Amino acid sequence: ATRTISCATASCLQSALKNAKPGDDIVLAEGVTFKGSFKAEASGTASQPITIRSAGSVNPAVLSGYSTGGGYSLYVTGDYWNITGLKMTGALKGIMLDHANHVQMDGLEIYDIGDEGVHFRDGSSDNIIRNSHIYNTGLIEAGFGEGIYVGSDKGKWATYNKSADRNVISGVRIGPGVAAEHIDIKEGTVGTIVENSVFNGTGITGANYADSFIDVKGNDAVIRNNIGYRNGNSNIVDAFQVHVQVAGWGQNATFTGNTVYLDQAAPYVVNAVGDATASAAGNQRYPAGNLYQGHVNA
Ligand code: NA
Ligand code: NA
């Protein structure tokens, strides 16, 4: 690191973020809860990232908001942050990224969130969340309780840049207690990857159409080598869906190598609705039952 800033109070962290520089290593004391609405605004580079991390993993540092009904645990608006080994809780959103790029989130535990756990928004691209667990979301609004939310609905494209592109979700556990989709990939996004992840469907509510592990409304999504457990939750109607919200979106979704445990024969593995298009290969369904619906090239 170029500079080490060791913090054990919220005031220390707030100051370290305000004064953040490329190459900073902001190291948060184990066992401490840092309460605030913390803002990661500066930008690093690939060679000089800005790091916020827990000092160790026995008792990770916690970033808490003030109330599940407001704010965020962390709001990232700059590029080239490494956010590592932290817990995030106690806010309306866990981590919100606005126009933030090349952010690496690793080893996070994000839980007890009013709305959505992680949201890539306003053009935030080329980011990764890996080796993390998101659970207990949608405590305030179930229908806004996604685990991971990529991009913006069409009604917000005039407000936020829709092109939250090439974001990667790798080796993540989502659920239980995630009230909406585990992953909602919005129209306007391109190239989202969801890989090597595990979906515990207990707690998906069905609110606001949220009745699958993943809904794919963006393009060029790659959904590979994941495991989904419906766990008898009747609110889950399909493992994965693809929808067209705007013509030419919900296109070219690829589903390979996934294994889904859907309890009964009725849920589909991939339900590509209407004009949506997908390709599928190597997916395993338990028990025997419905596989693909729609324009699915199998
Ligand atoms: Na749905
Ligand atoms: Na949703």
Residue numbers in the entry: 36 to 333
What's written in the study?
In this study, we experimentally determined the function of a putative protein, as a novel alginate lyase (PsAly), whose gene is found beside two characterised chitinase genes (chiC and chiD) in the genome. Bacterial alginate lyases can degrade alginate into oligosaccharides or monosaccharides. Lyases catalyse a β-elimination reaction of glycoside bonds to yield a 4,5-unsaturated sugar, 4-deoxy-L-erythro-hex-4-enopyranosyluronic acid, at the non-reducing end11. PsAly preferentially degraded the glycosidic bond of PM over PG and MG.
PsAly folds into a right-handed β-helix structure comprising 10 β-stranded coils and one α-helix cap at the N-terminus, with overall dimensions of 26 × 28 × 52 Å. The long cleft from the N-terminus to the C-terminus is formed by the external surface of PB1, T1, and T3, of approximately 20 × 10 × 15 Å. After refinements with replacement of these ions on the sites, the Fo–Fc electron density map showed strong negative peaks in the presence of calcium ions on the sites, while the map in the presence of the sodium ions showed no such strong negative peaks. The residues Tyr184 and Lys221 were located near the first cation binding site. Considering the position of the ligand and the mutagenic results, the sidechains of Tyr184 and/or Lys221 are the most likely candidates for the base and/or acid catalysts.
